[PDB]
Amino acid sequence: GSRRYDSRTTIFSPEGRLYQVEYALESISHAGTAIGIMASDGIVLAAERKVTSTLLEQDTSTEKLYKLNDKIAVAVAGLTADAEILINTARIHAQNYLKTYNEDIPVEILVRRLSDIKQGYTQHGGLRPFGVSFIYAGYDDRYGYQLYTSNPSGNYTGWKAISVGANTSAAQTLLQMDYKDDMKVDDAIELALKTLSKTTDSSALTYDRLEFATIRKGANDGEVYQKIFKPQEIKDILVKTGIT
Template sequence: MGSRRYDSRTTIFSPEGRLYQVEYALEAISHAGTSIGVLSNEGIVLAAEKKVTSKLLEKDSSEKMYVLNDQCVTAVAGLNSDAGILVNTARVYAQQYLARYNEPVPIEVLVHRLCDIKQGYTQYGGLRPFGVSFIYAGYDDRYGFQLYTSNPSGNYSGWKATSVGANNSAAQTLLKQDYKEDISLKEAKELVLKVLSKTMDSTTLTKGKIELATVSKKNGKIVTKIWKPSEIDALLKETGIVKEENEENEEIN
């Protein structure tokens, strides 16, 4: 009952020093599909649970993975509509930086820019926090491959392996157990699929229920890639995590 006096305005602190609207945004994210990122010396792997699965959807449609520029990909957890405006902002800023300085934007600078915007939406009246968390996977010449997360409060942090969304605690525990410092890109792919298979609500991991993206280096050039369902299916069969395809008869509304 006491919180109702303070939760109708984004900018009002409760007597305990809490901003309820920010906490509500974080709670919304905790119910979103799990997204996972793993960093290796050879690149970065992002994987996410796809909540809406239907045979009527376009096969290559993506709701969780977005390319921000030629060196950065992001996975989202939360409200996709909120994510869309921030993704567009990041893309514009990345191109403006490239035009001004004639070099790709450093990954942390890009993350910092988005977090400044998110923080502003916790501070001014008439606005609400963005209900979305991001996992950023990118590369720049100074720090190499980097993995960051950010949340509605505007905080961000760097990680070797991380997760956001539903079943976050279980996913983090599994990542702590199985992550190793010298992990290869191939092992990182296997790890994210293994963690997703144990934390998703569904009992079977199939190409229609997950999205996958990678940032890697090939012939000295950075390659950002959002995987197609057929490529995910081949990877699942290669790793032995899925034995058969049974998604055609399954639809989640």
């Protein structure tokens, strides 16, 4: 019968590893680097677009940074198509929570549920896992500013600063070197860009090959604002830190 052609996506290796999860992580390691840095007064999300073409429409484009609700955003590393399936699910889950409790969903609860879906694809169903790693940047009134990452295994962890995709080894060393706890958003913005600028496989880091977003309390009195940076705004912040 059909047994002949079954890859068996949800099995262990002799060493006790999940083949398909390991190979999905290998896939993600070739994806454009995404960095999350959590400051005391906000969060930075920086992501490198995959080898841009000059005729790509840059201003009306979304590849890396997606909005889940007013308080939570994600940086993507891996298959974009896979990420959009999970993002629409996460957006619905957030609205289900709000509809049920009349309160915005706590960041970890959204992350856990999205990570539980990924876990499912590794244990049952005989389907390939989602070739996606997320950086979750969000705020709630319990833990304040939070950074999480999830990967195809469905395992998630919290971070002060983290990188996913390509050159994470090199990127994590540079973040570990220059990061400190009393850091501001404006300083975190500079760290995020400087780290990409050194770890990039490109000749020079330019505005057209970046996606950038902040989650500050920079709005008027005790409320959170999500800023998805425009091309011209990235061009200005890149000059202001002295990279171009």
